[PDB]
Amino acid sequence: MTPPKAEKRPYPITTHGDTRVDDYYWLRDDERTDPQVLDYLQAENAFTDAALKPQQALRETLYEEMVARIPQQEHSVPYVRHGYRYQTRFEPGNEYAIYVRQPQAESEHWDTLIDGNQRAEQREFYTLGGLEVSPDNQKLAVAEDFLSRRQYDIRFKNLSDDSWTDEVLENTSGSFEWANDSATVYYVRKHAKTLLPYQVYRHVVGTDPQLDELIYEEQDDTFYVGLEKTTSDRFILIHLSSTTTSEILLLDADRADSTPQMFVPRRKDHEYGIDHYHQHFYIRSNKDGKNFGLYQSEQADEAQWQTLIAPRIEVMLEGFSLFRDWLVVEERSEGLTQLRQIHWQSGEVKRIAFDDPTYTTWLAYNPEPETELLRYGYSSMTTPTTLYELNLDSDERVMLKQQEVKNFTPENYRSERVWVKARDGVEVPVSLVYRHDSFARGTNPLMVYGYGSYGSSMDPAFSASRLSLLDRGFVFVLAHIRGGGELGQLWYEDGKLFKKQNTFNDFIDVTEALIAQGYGDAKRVFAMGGSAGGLLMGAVINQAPELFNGIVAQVPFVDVVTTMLDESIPLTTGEYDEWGNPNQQAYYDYILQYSPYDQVKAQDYPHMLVTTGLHDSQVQYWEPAKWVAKLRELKTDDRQLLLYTDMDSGHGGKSGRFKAYEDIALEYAFILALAE
Ligand SMILES: *CC(=O)[C@H](CCCCN)NS(=O)(=O)c1ccc(C)cc1
């Protein structure tokens, strides 16, 4: 009964002589210090509560259904690192993992490093960003988010007696490494207002952080500061990264007074990363090709890099792991992840087959290089997430664990890789899955999912929650659209900057091909995207509103032009080589044509559920809030338009193994009611 009507306070923004009027600009508050804002967000939540009350039963049915799939007890396969065996445990009803370990010689008794349920201690949000035991096995460092804004606290535990030290490192990125003395930690501090990771500090454990020494400050705010430690343990790396360009600095992990030593000075459009092992640096670099190569060197000097793997236009080299006798690399070709092993001596090459049309494989955690046992991951649209161990020499493979899914028989579902020819003749890969026994050409609701930014890939993986749609006749689709990484670096570059419109075109083209070929019911087409996938949702409903019956747009990036004009707002300065720099006229004009907030107009929009989190640090809460306000004022349809603001979460929604399914049940009930 009557949606809330945002206050209008005309706010002009002038760039290149173009004045845009933002009536809803006031919805932005930089602390949360304006009662007017909360009142709007609270009123939208009350309208959403009232409007979705009918589905109360169906939500609790789906919640209960999704929870019923999950083993209540869930134990990881143990591993051994520096004389200790480690395991991660959920016990019945637990929202968060318990991390335990024991001496390698021991079997009966395990010690608790940390209990997430104890640490979460009543709070609506908790994330362990990282935990790591000192090289001397005496101390534990943990990075925890208590709020959901990804401002990680770092704290330290004495493992001998399970006491905590007095100090906390605040507003960190959660990225840290131990010096080899186990007394010092290096860690990354975030800018107080932009939240950009920009400073490395040295901290002596057990001391006041006011005494922490600044080691490196990144002067160019288009870059991110991270920390890594090499396989050799000789170096802690300052990894400075941006869209286009890398630089690594070495810190001697064996010394207390290390200062950053330059590896290779930054060069525009040269991305590199390194490890150190067997006395050599191993470099993944795009110096000679966009799809990257792998290089070995005794020295930093780029002229000395020996080619191990030459860049191939057909193969994206993505990642690598170093063993005693084998190099193992993660590669992508024909839209599919593979792993390849190369013997350092014989140069013999072996590849890991998978015949599934619709899977992902990856290097899992391998704590020790001195072994012939590779642990690697596998998941598909039809096979739950699996941990394999491969003997690299004998080829024998053992399945260590497959995720148990209750109330599920894989033989009931089938998946396909389909190729869709886009409006410009370019072939776009699609992964889809459905329940065979309920499938009939032309009759099944479609759920089409896209992201398509940053060269991130929507790799086909198993979802247990997704069975709630598959078991009600849905065909679930991953559209591997340009801007994503699915076909290598050129696929990414062909969907950003002056090519970003290809992301949106590709998603429409895939959706129309699928309806034309009878995979979906033309009246029951749903789409979902989050964050950069929310940009996708926003652009496609402006451009092709009548295509979709209903839309879920999570933490959506929609105020593109205003956001990219403002260096004060988190992530802006790091994304000029993604969308463009709208201080430049060409970029301003190109981006304005798709910026969803700016292109809302008087037309019929599909049914829409917009979700955000008040603390969201990547897409600030006001973008979706403004976008809903402006949609409510101008839309000509009277279809559902709901805003759900979670007051106690951020970019990744509700924390907790079971709690997360509250958001998915709400989303899926909204879609299922429209598919009745
Ligand atoms: C969650 C998401 O897609 C957001 C959108 C942020 C838009 C900022 N104006 N991106 S992110 O911050 O999570 C992010 C994810 C991957 C990469 C490579 C960069 C940023």
Author numbering: 2 to 677
From the publication, what sentences describe this entry?
Oligopeptidases B (OpBs, EC 3.4.21.83) are trypsin-like serine peptidases that belong to the prolyl oligopeptidase (POP) family (S9 family) of clan SC. Endopeptidases from the S9A subfamily cleave peptide bonds on the carbonyl side of either proline (POPs) or basic amino acid residues (OpBs). The catalytic domain includes the α/β-hydrolase fold, which is canonical for serine proteases and is located at the C-terminal part of the molecule, and the N-terminal loop, which is divided from the α/β hydrolase fold by the regulatory β-propeller domain. The β-propeller domain consists of seven blade-shaped beta sheets arranged around the central axis according to the open Velcro topology (no connection between first and last blades) and restricts access of substrates larger than 3 kDa to the catalytic triad located in the interdomain cavity.
The structure of wild type SpOpB bound to tosyl-L-lysine chloromethyl ketone (TCK) was determined at 2.2 Å resolution. The unit cell dimensions of the SpOpB-TCK crystal were 75.529 Å × 89.660 Å × 108.650 Å, a crystallographic space group was P2(1)2(1)2(1), an asymmetric unit contained a monomer in a crystal lattice. A clear electron density for one molecule of covalently bound TCK, which is a modified lysine residue tosylated at the N-terminus and chloromethylated at the C-terminus, was observed from the 2mFo-DFc difference map in the active site. The closed state of SpOpB was associated with covalent binding of a single TCK molecule to the catalytic S532 and H652 residues. The binding to the OG atom of S532 occurs through the hemiacetal carbon atom of TCK, and to the NE2 atom of H652, it occurs through the methylene group of TCK. Despite the presence of spermine in the crystallization mixture, no spermine molecules were found in the crystal structure. According to these criteria, the newly obtained structure of SpOpB-TCK indeed represents the closed state of the enzyme. The SpOpB-TCK complex can be considered as an analogue of the transition state in the proteolytic reaction catalyzed by S532. The position of the lysine side chain of TCK coincides with the position of the P1 arginyl of AIP and the position of the tosyl ring coincides with that of the P2 valine of AIP. Both the lysine amino group of TCK and the arginyl guanidino group of AIP interact with E576 and E607 carboxyl groups of SpOpB and TbOpB, respectively. The carbonyl group of P2 valine of AIP is H-bound to the R650-NH1 atom of TbOpB, while the similarly located O1S atom of TCK is H-bound to the Q619-NE2 of SpOpB.
